[PDB]
Design a protein around this nucleic acid. Structure first.
Ligand code: MG
Ligand code: MG
Lengths: 101, 313, 314
RNA sequence: AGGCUUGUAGCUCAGGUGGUUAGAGCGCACCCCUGAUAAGGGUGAGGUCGGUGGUUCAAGUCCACUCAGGCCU
């Protein structure tokens, strides 16, 4: 098997994935999504509303776009970063599937 | 002379109310909140326990376990109370204290799992209860139990056919488990022999997994506000060879139609109820669906969702 | 072939269910929670609008004012939304955000009166509105409108008689306005001619104003938390000639029996629903009532009372 | 005059055998956070690939000639 080197996009897509997990996939964000999926509020400090569903649609678009970049590659640093993207999506979808039914 | 022996037998026989101000008077609304726990799920909380008693697995001594965070937990709680059985509902810690008061005052044993795992932590906990003593606990599995679409083939199928006198041309129902869409389409297309029925499913646009399954695509689930539908996967009760069309509904136009369906009609309707009516409005914008009688399932009431964002101020 | 033309035509035909674990098993509960606004009031919230259309006073162009915050405010809200009228409910300012959000959702103009007054302030502003433009507003007056006991003679009375097949011996119903007790007792004692029916009335012990009127004493009300019954006076719809017994249910006995009616028999019951079953249990302590078909009305659902004292569990 | 070489988003730049159209860093707009600033994170906008022709199933990439800069001359 011929090992390859990264583009400037694949090495961007690795650093986007690892920073999306350590800042947007906290346990607070999966709580606040499920609070928002059936309506009951998590308010702001003095008014307004924190929209956790829009911030998880953004996280799911990010982790799916940045895993499609790193999908058919052959660098072991980029196949290992693909594993964190697929496992982070499976962490989200296992919290969402069959909810409210 | 009909005295009911318990409240689980009082399911069904719900009105088919014509909508006079949402649409052109052809949309017929089947109010499914006229049930003993005020959801469409009351039909399946009765028949899944009826079926378990017929095939001998539900004896005196056998308890009931099912992971749920919706109207199925209310529907299993009154039938286990009416028939006289025990129930344990596993669910995340996210849901409200006012939802847990309705289940605990109705005779359920709530097991609250940690909310960061979501429903899989609520699902996988229900197997450690069953694997503790498998001869004692029963798992109902609403997404794969064939008693879920069979209550709709026996009850809510013939109710639509006898109210419309066989004139229903389009049937529209949202799909959370798929027993309602499959059972009605089995009675009208299969038993009564009307192949021309158009069975339209309703899904969220933020999780359009039925349209991705029909188009051969990878499954793309996501969070949505239309509670009741949008499972994130294709369940075993949904038969995709009967789904003739699928219409996606955004979260703001589902909440907008439910507020119309209260204010202009007097029907207390949840978000999934307004999502299914708005699919009938999107379908009637086509000019071939203007002399068609449309039957729309309205699965829940709005009073249950009264602390939510359906009621703004 | 039955397609209902609006949601208000779907009242009635509520099932009569046997209570197997409460009593000896001859209590027959009629669950009035399965009406289109989930109360007993849907029947009178529809008939009083149907009667006003036929009297010629509810034309296209006239309003509806009713000093009412409870179940019959919800019942007038969905019928006026189903049939196209405009509703203005007058009620005190000390009411919950939650019930006000259910009434704006059905399209009801809510006018808020002073909280130091209470209910008699809500009545007085309703007659201030009708006195402004008498041709354009309209009261309904559920305590004195004869369409309140008329619909129970046309719907509730037959549904008890044709489901029991003529075997109802005792009829327990709570009296808040005295329509469901009057209408069914006029059907069975009057039309079908069964004078042996024992029509009893459930009242609070803190406000026993029906027992003070039958004993010839001064009517003195009091506060209670069996909401739905106990108006504090004898309404004009309640005729005392039909009432045989009067049973006073204590406020903790209604909470305990409604919880007992949910967890043992699967019926979502409010506080007044538990008060009416508790009167059936007090009546079965006599051996003369243990072979009687007790028929009891369950007027509301416990999911509406979900923030009240009925749910003291975490 | 010859042999070469630079030209890709507002700036500096990668672009592997001719295959996602075309991508990164800084900067612009929005969102989380910092009482606030910096630091740090995410999403989006921005492209006659110098110009014109040829070839190929397909050209930013391969050729032919020009336009502007640097090298010995
Ligand atoms: Mg966060
Ligand atoms: Mg440049």
């Amino acid at each position: 098997k011929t090992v390859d080197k990264l583009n400037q996009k694949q090495e961007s897509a690795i650093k986007k994935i690892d920073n999306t997990i350590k800042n947007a996939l906290k346990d607070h964000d999966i709580i606040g999504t499920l609070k928002d999926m059936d309506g009951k509020p998590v308010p702001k400090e003095n008014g307004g509303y924190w929209d956790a569903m829009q911030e998880m649609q953004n996280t799911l678009r990010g982790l799916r776009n940045h895993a499609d970049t790193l999908k058919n590659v052959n660098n072991p640093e980029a196949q290992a970063a693909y594993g964190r993207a697929t496992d982070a999506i499976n962490k989200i979808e296992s919290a969402l599937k069959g909810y409210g039914i | 002379s009909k005295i009911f022996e318990d409240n689980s037998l009082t399911i069904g026989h719900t009105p088919l109310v014509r909508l006079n101000r949402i649409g052109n008077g052809r949309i017929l609304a089947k109010v499914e909140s006229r049930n003993p726990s005020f959801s469409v799920k009351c039909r399946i909380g009765a028949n899944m326990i009826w079926d378990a008693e017929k095939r001998g697995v539900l004896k005196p001594g056998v308890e009931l376990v099912e992971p749920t965070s919706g109207n199925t937990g209310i529907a299993l709680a009154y039938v286990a109370a009416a028939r006289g059985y025990k129930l344990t509902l596993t669910m995340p810690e996210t849901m409200s204290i006012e939802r847990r008061k309705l289940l605990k005052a109705l005779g359920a044993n709530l097991v609250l799992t940690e909310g960061a795992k979501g429903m899989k932590g609520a699902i996988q906990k229900a197997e450690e209860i069953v694997a503790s003593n498998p001869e004692k606990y029963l798992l109902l599995q609403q997404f794969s139990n064939p008693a879920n679409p069979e209550i709709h083939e026996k009850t809510t199928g013939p109710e639509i056919w006898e109210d419309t006198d066989g004139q229903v041309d389009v049937f529209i129902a949202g799909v959370g488990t798929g027993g309602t869409l499959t059972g009605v389409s089995r009675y009208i297309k299969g038993t009564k022999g009307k192949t021309d029925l158009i069975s339209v499913a309703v899904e969220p646009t933020d999780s359009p997994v039925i349209a991705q399954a029909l188009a051969g695509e990878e499954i793309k689930p996501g969070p949505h506000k239309i509670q009741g539908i949008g499972a994130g996967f294709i369940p075993a009760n949904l038969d995709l060879k009967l789904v003739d069309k699928v219409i996606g509904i955004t979260n703001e136009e589902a909440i907008s139609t439910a507020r119309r369906l209260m204010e202009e009609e007097g029907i207390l309707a949840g978000i999934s109820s307004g999502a299914a009516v708005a699919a009938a409005l999107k379908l009637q914008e086509d000019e071939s669906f203007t002399n068609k009688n449309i039957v729309v399932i309205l699965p829940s009431s709005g009073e249950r969702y009264l602390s939510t964002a359906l009621f703004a101020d």
